[PDB]
Amino acid sequence: IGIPFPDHSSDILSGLNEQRTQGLLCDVVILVEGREFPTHRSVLAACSQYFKKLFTSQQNVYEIDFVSAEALTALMDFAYTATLTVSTANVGDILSAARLLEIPAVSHVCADLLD
Amino acid sequence: IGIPFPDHSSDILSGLNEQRTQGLLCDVVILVEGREFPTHRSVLAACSQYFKKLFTSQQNVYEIDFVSAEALTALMDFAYTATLTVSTANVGDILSAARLLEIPAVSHVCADLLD
Ligand SMILES: [Pr+3]
Ligand SMILES: [Pr+3]
Ligand SMILES: [Pr+3]
Ligand SMILES: [Pr+3]
Ligand SMILES: [Pr+3]
Ligand SMILES: [Pr+3]
Secondary structure (H helix, E strand, O other): OOEEOOOHHHHHHHHHHHHHHHOOOOOEEEEEOOEEEEEOHHHHHHHOHHHHHHHOOOOOEEEOOOOOHHHHHHHHHHHHHOEEOOOOOOHHHHHHHHHHHOOHHHHHHHHHHHO | OOEEOOOHHHHHHHHHHHHHHHOOOOOEEEEEOOEEEEEOHHHHHHHOHHHHHHHOOOOOEEEOOOOOHHHHHHHHHHHHHOEEOOOOOOHHHHHHHHHHHOOHHHHHHHHHHHO
């Protein structure tokens, strides 16, 4: 009968972030403005519908031309840590990018912060 | 400045569990007592030191002969949901398996439940 581990999902995420930090067990590179982001297909697909569609339908490197390197870094950081670092002036920029990547947790929140 | 998402890691884990359930974006198969478990290398490595060592050092299928299919199913379920389903009689069995896979969250708890 289910022993609950309330810290487990965050411990998992931390471990995946360690992998990302260390360039370990990353199976895809996102390329944005000439900048490369080694990540996990699976983690991206679990929080972005753009990426789920992309990976469940090039081969190791995928270019994104419709978000800034700066927004993608903030959103990839969010994906892997559960914290979105944003300044008051940039909320609308992150909203625009999260809608295009279809990361609804971030889109809903940022839209609420703008009215 | 970090907007915190307290539900995000569990939403990520849920998404990875969906992938596992649906056989999507799984990059390894664990083989135990003739039974195959499509999973993610990255998720296994984030919670088991046995698996982190295994994957950061065959190629798509990895046999485990030192835990039961029944214990591995319970521990893989835990890995992907943050709940360990166990009966009162099986705590010691799961403890034995978690120590061999080096899943310290489960080992510490099960040892405490046995004294
Ligand atoms: Pr960790
Ligand atoms: Pr307003
Ligand atoms: Pr206004
Ligand atoms: Pr989900
Ligand atoms: Pr006692
Ligand atoms: Pr006793």
